Ligand binder design. Structure first.
Ligand SMILES: CC(=O)SCC[N+](C)(C)C
Length: 286
């Protein structure tokens, strides 16, 4: 190990349902009130306080561990570019990573970026899910290259505006997601996530060096592989079945959710989010 990075007192989080701590719920409630075409209530009835899980997301645990306030801009469905898996949001708000970056910068209205705040980025899953669900054109190698470029551009744009500290999360292991397994798409997920995770850290290391940034890379795939190889160590028992099935329809939730890896068919449980948050916090002093 090298020296721990300096303490963190403010996080700005950008990303998708792996981080969202209430934004998709707030926005969809707004959209429903306004009669927006296509709007639906997200995340749904079988979720904890608007999180796409049964508890806090990894970034919420990271903030708790580190003693930081959290401004969590992440939106369930968010892609790495401007928009969302949920196409019907585009007309109302651009909620992808690039959209969230634009909205954060516009809220600053010329005032300075907090150079001490950690800019946490965790996105790309929906790039893959939209591509598979709506038969996207690109070869997965090209889709991964677009994901990588999008995330690099978000770091560059935040740095441009004055951000100095970043934590960028890798692709998760999409290959073990229950919906991917049920779609017989394990190899395509493997190929997509390997491409993102090989390229992105090399691009971010160059950007870090050029702009004098503090940028930490969190390898979520290494993290999940280690958990899923040694589950008993962490008190996990069921790695594959969702605790709270939703497809084809909502069924009764499992008795022992802290023994389950997956909450629904796409999203991990509060236990896994806890472990992930603790792992992410390990690079920083309290
Ligand atoms: C209830 C669900 O999660 S459906 C899948 C939606 N997703 C593509 C945005 C993850």
């Amino acid at each position: 190990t090298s020296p721990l990075l300096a303490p963190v007192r403010q996080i700005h989080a950008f990303g998708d349902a792996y981080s969202d701590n209430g934004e998709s719920q707030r926005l969809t409630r707004e959209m429903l009130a306004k009669g927006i075409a296509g709007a639906q209530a997200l995340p749904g009835e079988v979720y904890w306080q608007g999180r796409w899980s049964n508890g806090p997301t990894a970034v919420e645990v990271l903030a708790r561990q580190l003693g930081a306030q959290l401004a969590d801009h992440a939106v369930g469905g968010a892609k790495s570019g401007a928009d969302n898996y949920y196409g019907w949001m585009s007309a109302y708000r651009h909620t992808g990573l690039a959209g969230q970056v634009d909205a954060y910068l516009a809220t600053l209205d010329g005032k300075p970026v907090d150079g001490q705040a950690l800019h946490f980025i965790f996105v790309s899953a929906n790039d893959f899910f939209e591509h598979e669900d709506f038969a996207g054109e690109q070869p997965l190698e090209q889709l991964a290259g677009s994901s990588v470029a999008n995330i690099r551009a978000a770091v560059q744009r935040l740095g441009e505006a004055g951000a100095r500290r970043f934590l960028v999360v890798s692709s998760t292991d999409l290959s073990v997601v229950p919906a991917v397994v049920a779609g017989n798409r394990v190899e395509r997920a493997q190929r997509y996530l390997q491409a993102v995770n090989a390229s992105l850290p090399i691009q971010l290391a160059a950007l870090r060096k050029t702009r004098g940034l503090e940028l930490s890379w969190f390898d979520h795939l290494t993290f999940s592989r280690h958990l899923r190889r040694n589950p008993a160590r962490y008190g996990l028992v069921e790695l594959d079945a969702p605790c709270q099935p939703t497809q084809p329809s909502v069924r009764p939730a499992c008795a022992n959710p802290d023994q389950y890896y997956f909450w629904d068919e796409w999203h991990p449980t509060r236990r896994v989010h806890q472990l992930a948050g603790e792992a992410m916090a390990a690079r920083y002093a309290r």
